[PDB]
Amino acid sequence: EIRVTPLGAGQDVGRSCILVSIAGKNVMLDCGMHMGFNDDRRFPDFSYITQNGRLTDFLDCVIISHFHLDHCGALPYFSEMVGYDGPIYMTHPTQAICPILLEDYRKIAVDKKGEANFFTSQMIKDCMKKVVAVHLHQTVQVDDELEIKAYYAGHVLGAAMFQIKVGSESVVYTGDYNMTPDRHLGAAWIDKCRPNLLITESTYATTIRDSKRCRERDFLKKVHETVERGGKVLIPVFALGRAQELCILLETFWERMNLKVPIYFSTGLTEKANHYYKLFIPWTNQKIRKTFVQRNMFEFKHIKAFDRAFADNPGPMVVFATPGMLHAGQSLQIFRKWAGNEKNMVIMPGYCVQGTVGHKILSGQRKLEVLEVKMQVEYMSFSAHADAKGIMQLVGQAEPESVLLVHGEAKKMEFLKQKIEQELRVNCYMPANGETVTLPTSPSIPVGISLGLLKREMAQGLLPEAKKPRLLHGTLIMKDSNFRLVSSEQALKELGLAEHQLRFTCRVHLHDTRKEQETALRVYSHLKSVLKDHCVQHLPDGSVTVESVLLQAAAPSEDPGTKVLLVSWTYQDEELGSFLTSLLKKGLPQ
RNA sequence: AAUAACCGGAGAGGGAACCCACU
Numbered sequence: 001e002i003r004v005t006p007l008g009a010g011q012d013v014g015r016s017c018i019l020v021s022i023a024g025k026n027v028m029l030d031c032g033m034h035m036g037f038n039d040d041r042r043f044p045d046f047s048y049i050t051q052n053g054r055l056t057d058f059l060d061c062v063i064i065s066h067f068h069l070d071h072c073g074a075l076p077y078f079s080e081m082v083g084y085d086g087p088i089y090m091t092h093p094t095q096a097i098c099p100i101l102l103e104d105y106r107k108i109a110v111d112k113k114g115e116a117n118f119f120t121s122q123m124i125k126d127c128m129k130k131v132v133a134v135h136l137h138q139t140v141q142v143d144d145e146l147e148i149k150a151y152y153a154g155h156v157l158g159a160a161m162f163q164i165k166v167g168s169e170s171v172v173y174t175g176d177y178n179m180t181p182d183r184h185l186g187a188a189w190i191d192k193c194r195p196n197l198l199i200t201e202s203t204y205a206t207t208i209r210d211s212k213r214c215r216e217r218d219f220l221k222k223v224h225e226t227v228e229r230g231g232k233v234l235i236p237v238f239a240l241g242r243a244q245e246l247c248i249l250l251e252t253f254w255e256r257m258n259l260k261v262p263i264y265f266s267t268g269l270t271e272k273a274n275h276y277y278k279l280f281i282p283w284t285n286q287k288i289r290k291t292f293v294q295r296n297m298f299e300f301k302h303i304k305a306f307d308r309a310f311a312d313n314p315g316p317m318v319v320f321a322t323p324g325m326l327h328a329g330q331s332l333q334i335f336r337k338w339a340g341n342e343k344n345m346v347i348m349p350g351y352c353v354q355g356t357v358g359h360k361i362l363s364g365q366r367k368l369e370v371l372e373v374k375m376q377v378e379y380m381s382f383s384a385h386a387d388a389k390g391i392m393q394l395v396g397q398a399e400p401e402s403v404l405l406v407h408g409e410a411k412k413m414e415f416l417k418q419k420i421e422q423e424l425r426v427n428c429y430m431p432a433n434g435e436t437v438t439l440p441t442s443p444s445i446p447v448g449i450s451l452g453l454l455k456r457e458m459a460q461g462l463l464p465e466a467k468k469p470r471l472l473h474g475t476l477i478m479k480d481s482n483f484r485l486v487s488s489e490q491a492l493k494e495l496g497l498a499e500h501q502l503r504f505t506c507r508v509h510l511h512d513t514r515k516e517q518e519t520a521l522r523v524y525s526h527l528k529s530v531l532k533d534h535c536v537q538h539l540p541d542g543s544v545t546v547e548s549v550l551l552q553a554a555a556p557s558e559d560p561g562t563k564v565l566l567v568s569w570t571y572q573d574e575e576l577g578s579f580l581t582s583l584l585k586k587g588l589p590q
Numbered sequence: 591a592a593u594a595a596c597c598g599g600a601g602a603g604g605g606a607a608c609c610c611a612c613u
């Protein structure tokens with residue numbers, strides 16, 4: 001049976017972490033933190049996986065979906081202080097990207113919280129030394145029986161679904177993923193695996209994201225008119241993910257329109273983001289991975305590293321900035337610099353954290369902290385998550401038998417569950433963090449078989465006698481190692497046992513005046529006339545043969561009015577033998 | 591679902607005597 005325990009993201013978001021007990025094996029999918037809980041409660045609990053012992057004893061392998069903090073932030077914490085030496089699996093881009101983000105988060109924690117018990121740079125290096133890489137569709141054998149497979153997801157560069165398969169049981173964990181192709185990442189694609197269980201997100205289960213092409217059309221019209229009006233453009237987006245997508249879109253449109261106004265990209269994370277997005281072309285969808293032959297889209301002709309002192313520079317400008325949340329806001333610096341002007345635009349392409357400067361700007365009040373904002377804000381949505389139609393399509397394609405939702409809100413969880421149960425007639429759940437859910441398996445045991453038996457049985461099935469039970473028979477030799485199904489005669493020869501033969505000879509008593517000499521001929525004629533399509537023959541010695549039943553006119557008995565007919569048959573044809581005896585009990589025609 | 595950490599972050603260490611040579 002399958003046991004699923006979400007240590008986080010249970011009808012919630014952040015610090016995603018799932019535990020799967022399958023066929024007696026424990027696998028930990030994803031282990032990250034989440035902001036907002038300055039206490040240790042941000043990290044996933046570990047008192048349930050192993051309580052207070054050694055983790056490797058109970059756990060089998062750790063799986064990381066993608067490099068977003070809320071998924072890859074707990075690796076140093078989970079694997080260094082708590083203690084873990086087991087295999088950690090994660091795609092090459094994830095392995096290359098997560099270390100930088102982890103170091104940045106470590107520095108941010110030092111600078112803001114300064115938690116005493118916090119992983120250190122040396123410890124991150126030690127943790128990442130213990131990683132193992134996985135390419136697309138590469139089945140990696142964690143052990144002799146457990147294997148993991150990856151898939152292209154596209155939530156960010158290198159994001160991947162995972163199919164954890166053992167024997168016949170299999171569980172597909174999607175984590176964060178997108179089904180709408182972006183401008184640099186292809187849509188997630190999967191086989192028709194038909195898993196028993198499917199873990200998926202619901203971050204946008206209640207929002208049918210509209211036509212992305214038209215959304216970006218509107219975005220580009222706004223930026224064009226903004227540059228025309230002479231104002232400046234500030235685009236806050238966190239340095240990874242959406243930043244590069246915006247950069248590609250603007251760069252291509254920009255080269256096409258041949259516009260010359262210089263555009264700047266926030267420094268700091270550029271030197272690493274661009275380098276990785278440049279060295280990892282073989283993940284970035286068809287358009288880029290083809291166009292790569294001539295030029296390399298990530299070597300930008302018109303995007304240059306930003307400079308702080310350019311903030312005062314006149315003339316219309318376009319500048320990306322960090323972070324998308326504005327909590328600290330190097331972007332917020334320029335925002336405060338230009339807040340007075342009404343000519344400039346600003347775009348917020350994502351959801352802001354409620355109760356922060358993000359929400360204060362989200363709301364339209366001028367007084368946002370007491371300083372008044374005057375420039376114009378546009379609340380765009382360029383999220384790379386899964387829309388309700390995306391989830392429904394993905395589940396339909398995978399054709400699973402049970403679903404399980406995490407990474408979202410409880411009410412949307414409920415709406416999505418109701419809709420999916422009504423639609424696909426599939427079991428669903430809603431585990432709250434720390435709640436274990438059990439599901440029954442179908443562990444069908446495999447078996448060997450001899451080729452010839454199957455060959456002739458299939459030939460018989462091919463013959464137009466189907467729909468009549470042919471009763472596939474034989475016997476199963478068991479060694480406790482290699483169960484092999486064999487035919488009766490093959491088993492007989494293999495085991496050396498004697499082929500016991502069971503013979504029944506019935507004395508039919510015929511009471512009629514017909515001569516004994518013609519009795520056998522009468523029997524032959526009557527059987528040939530009655531048993532249609534039966535092999536009825538008259539042997540030269542006066543006996544009769546019906547299939548394998550031999551009818552012999554015995555020697556004359558002491559009763560003149562009674563004639564003895566020995567009907568001898570084997571057990572296999574005993575059905576026809578008994579039928580012949582019953583027919584003959586009625587007596588021969590006279 | 592995380593953000594510019596000075597980014598040419600530069601002061602220097604004997605001295606005391608003797609002889610030579612330039613005006």
Ligand SMILES: [Zn+2]
Pocket residue numbers: 066068070071155176
């Ligand atoms: Zn994510």
Ligand SMILES: [Zn+2]
Pocket residue numbers: 014068070071176407
């Ligand atoms: Zn996430």
